Design a protein around this ligand. Structure first.
Ligand code: FES
Length: 106
């Protein structure tokens, strides 16, 4: 599998999220820890407003609107494609997923 993050300006750092990890976990090292969420796997912040591709946000879980409530008033706008970086794992099923960065960074 593979995982590449993007920035609202294009800056995208590629990496490999082991199986059973979250783009946030691989972020602690890959450096996305700075270009990813903040509260971590937890869901109390809104800086993890990442904008993922349309073919990789499917394999991931279907986080209802529950966790969306806090991700609904984020500092930016959200769409069905956005996802709290602290709520998506990159299993061997998804490969070469394209994650993006919110319009802002809280
Ligand atoms: S990283 Fe804090 S809510 Fe997702």
């Amino acid at each position: 599998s593979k995982v590449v993050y993007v920035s609202h300006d294009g800056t995208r750092r590629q990496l490999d999220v082991a199986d059973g990890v979250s783009l946030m976990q691989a972020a602690v090292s890959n450096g996305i820890y700075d270009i990813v969420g903040d509260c971590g796997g937890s869901a109390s912040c809104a800086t993890c407003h990442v904008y993922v591709n349309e073919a990789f946000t499917d394999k991931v879980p279907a986080a209802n609107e529950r966790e969306i409530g806090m991700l609904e008033c984020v500092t930016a706008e959200l769409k069905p494609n956005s996802r709290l970086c602290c709520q998506i794992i990159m299993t061997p099923e998804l490969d070469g997923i394209v994650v993006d960065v919110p319009d802002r960074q809280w």
